[PDB]
Symmetry: D2
Subunit: 307 residues, 4 copies
């Protein structure tokens, strides 16, 4: 409807969330600790292609866990639901690495994302694999900003002892397809987490998922309907770490958060969004972003089961 | 759109699911073991009021766990989200009785339903409490069949040792509101499970939830929008026992199953349904009903994230 | 050897432990909250019959969990290792009520003691059952003080919601022998916990276990060698609540603590002891008693693996 | 007493256990699968130095987990109870890698042994560390057979994905002393597991523990009394994998089993023993060895709490 009046509300919601100074910027690597707690940006991209931005929407930041639903969508687009879910589950967990079937709980947890990473473009080397994913992300963003943080990659690889423990654990329990270089897969996993985006480019990626796989700025089909439906289902139940259950109840929208302070939000057949503010709460979610998401659903009535 | 052609498809889906002879009729009490495995009925009730039935849709059966979302909707309608969720959670579990906050995981598990039962019409005796719930269920069904099985009630009460263990456990951990007769609450809980419905009357109850709290045959407001949205959210993630996660992924519709073989299904702003076939699978869900639900979403594209 | 010099050391150890004012007297029932934190008594009874007492050794207090190894010894004496352990385990746990075989972990936990209680003198009523156990305890104490607290019994029964939850849970999982009145068994369980002893009489009970089932003051055989060996094994690994593992490592003696502040200690083929001080630590063990036990083993070198 | 008559009983017990053909020889590496299921040897070495052997007592086999109590005894001998237990627990577990304090449950589990390995001779390289342990083992065996299997070492290192997952997990949770080369510690761990012994030499090692740290054939003090007492306590409760609880109850002797089929058994102030038969049961313990241990305690009454 009237997009001009909608932007005035997005600005009001941005201003209300801006007053939330709580949270702690992630500091496990210097590449995250660097960031200012005052950084806050909201970008909207509708299914029709209408754009609106407010705040620090052109400052690049790492996708981190926000890439998990994207690399999962590529795996389903290329291999289908059946092949992918032979290796990874489709529901949240109650932490342990595997479920009762010796499979990672879902693609939104580290163990699940490491296994999904092992399914994408099997056979070729990591350089070709990375280019393949980058090309897919470029199409999803409509050729907008998609970069890479070598400093983040080197730091994640050097300090990722928990991810190496997950790696050897999955190797022991035969979780990867036959003939997988586990360490090479971890390198590719760290590379994908280090991919940089801005609120603006990432809002187009979420808009592609909100428009059934079609990019709203190019009209091009990037992902299959099967891939989008699966990704949105798992974003609705597993996207916000331990807050996933409460986010499904109070917000009810497919979303995915990252340690850099990003929250990739999808409003089915309406719009794509990307909120970003580095200070995270006890669950690891953006404080300003979680506040904004609660206000957006309460104002525009976007909830899955809102009449 | 064309309802006449839609019924032809409902009949085809009914006929396909009829060929599924697997499952085991519940036998923990004689009142359930009595039932024929061949009983199979599907009833539809749209938001506009259009009805269609196929099979054994007039044979009464107990709601059992299908009442859990209904008594939860009454609690939220009368007390609001905040009061209710001080006593019960809003997400599934990974079994234990309480979560990390000494609260039952969600209203769709026995411990959660026992606590919800303790919130409805506090102060009055069980006879007034039961009449209050029956009146609400009558309004939800549009004054259609809502009965009671005294044989089921007596049997559930005499053999419900697990529910008495849950009862004393919740009493020890101070889960009920101050001044609660725990045993009286268990009696009321067993009474609610023993309420009988037919596929036809129960399809109107699910249609009230699909029509934002308005009964499609009376036009009357039965439940508040807050109550309906909460009930549908928890039916989407906790309604099908251990199959809840897989049902959210493959079907993506608010539904609730019972040990009598019933599956109360809701299609938001479209229709209400009730499938019933006594033989249950290893998860405790109706074999014919689960098969029908998968076929319905694959044919009419009713999934939450289907474009 | 020289008993006169040994008593001087027992008095020194008593005086050192007396300075430990920490802990909290149990207050879940008024019958325990009543007790003074300054009460502290140590009684010794050697295998030869030599006695020594220091402090409040004639003030009666409830056995509480200190009765658990005693009622277990009666069950093995009458039914044998094989019959008893068909219903209860023989090792500690990592809380849940049952192990992977749907059996309580060991006889020193509430669920294990409730099941052991259901094996003693089956067939007769609770009045005959209680007299049978009291007669056994009298023989174990050499006809010394063995009383009963009706106030404790009434209070434990009225507030024992956790024990009723355990009771119905064991009934559901078919843990009791066929034809058991679960509620009657709980009544008998509460009665056994309410049996009163003094440090002096209880030291003779521990001396019977230290003298292979023979009472050191009467010379009479009370328990079979099979019963004593089993009881001592389980006291060594399960007797001190969550501190059992640390007590096995640092003290290495068969012991059992109770909520009244008692610690029934056994020194194989040497002596029986009973320490009592109502203030308990975070694990539920007597602060003065735990301190005394560590000092006794460090001074006299009584540890199981001390050369 | 009469050693000549005792050997006749050891031979009878050997012959009875020889008839037990059940079990499966470990096959995760070819170096274990190689072994014959018919291999069976029992060696005795008393505190006085009296020796007796029956069966395949001169065929070398890897210590494997039988080295865990030995390397733990060296750590306590050099660093004391307090320093060692800052890094590792002192009790069994209910599998997870760490306890509630982010410490491995006990030194008899892989995670506990890897951490113990990181405490021995810190500072020097792995070649000096290995020589230090070998020298200690030589003194414990009275200069008898102590060798090394390079084939086992290479195979354990190449296939030890579970141990590498444990390694990175302990590194993430800061379980090792500051400045530890985790991979170098894993190499040393694999080397210690690959040390070879015969029933004869290993019976002298167990006799040193049974003689309070003194080697019965040399009279030399190898381990401190504090080290021996701690090792024996943890062998009594954690030495037989998941059968530890049942072995403590029915046998009640400090013992430690290995995947090669060895069971290092200690009889305090009486004798040291080593039973070996490659076929293992579902718990990972030697079938012939477990049978022999039950018969030995039933015949000679060696149990900890046997009068
Ligand atoms: O613990 C928490 C939360 C928490 C977290 C941190 C600190 C404090 C509390 N909440 C609980 N709620 N209810 C609990 N106990 C129920 C009642 C008895 N029971 C069992 N009795 N026996 C059981 N046995 C098993 O669960 C083996 C099993 C193994 C395989 C297959 C089936 C069962 S559970 C389950 S605990
Ligand atoms: O078990 C199953 C399924 C299953 C079911 C039935 C039979 C067989 C398998 N799957 C697993 N996946 N991953 C597992 N282990 C990981 C790796 C090490 N780890 C921990 N190491 N230490 C831990 N410690 C804790 O979890 C205390 C704790 C307590 C309070 C707060 C935090 C932690 S978990 C967790 S197990």
């Amino acid at each position: 409807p009237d997009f001009m009046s909608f932007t005035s509300h997005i600005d009001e919601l941005y201003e209300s969330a801006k007053k939330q100074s709580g949270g702690k910027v992630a500091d496990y690597i210097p590449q995250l600790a660097k960031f200012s707690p005052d950084l806050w940006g909201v970008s909207v991209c509708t299914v029709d292609g209408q754009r609106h931005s407010t705040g620090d929407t052109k400052v690049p930041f790492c996708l981190q866990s926000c890439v998990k639903p994207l690399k999962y969508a590529i795996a389903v687009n290329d291999l289908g639901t059946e092949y992918v879910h032979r290796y990874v589950g489709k529901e949240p967990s109650g932490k342990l690495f595997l479920n009762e079937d010796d499979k990672p709980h879902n693609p939104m947890v580290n163990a699940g994302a490491i296994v999904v990473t092992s399914l994408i473009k099997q056979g070729v080397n990591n350089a070709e694999k990375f280019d393949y994913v980058m090309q897919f992300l470029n199409k999803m963003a409509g050729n907008e900003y998609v970069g890479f943080s070598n400093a983040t990659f080197q730091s994640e690889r050097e300090s990722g002892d928990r991810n190496f423990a997950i790696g050897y654990y999955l190797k022991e329990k035969k979780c990867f397809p036959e003939g997988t270089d586990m360490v090479g897969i971890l390198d590719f996993y760290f590379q994908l987490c280090s991919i940089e985006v801005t609120c603006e480019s990432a809002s187009v990626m979420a808009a592609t998922l909100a428009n059934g796989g079609f990019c709203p700025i190019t009209g091009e089909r990037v992902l299959s309907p099967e891939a989008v439906r699966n990704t949105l289902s798992l974003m609705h139940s597993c996207g916000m770490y331990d807050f996933s259950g409460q986010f499904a109840f109070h917000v009810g929208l497919p979303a995915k958060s990252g340690v850099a302070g990003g929250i990739l939000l999808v409003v089915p057949n309406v719009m794509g969004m990307m909120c970003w503010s580095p200070p995270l709460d006890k669950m690891g979610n953006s404080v300003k972003g979680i506040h904004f998401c609660h206000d957006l659903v309460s104002l525009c009535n976007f909830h899955n089961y809102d009449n």
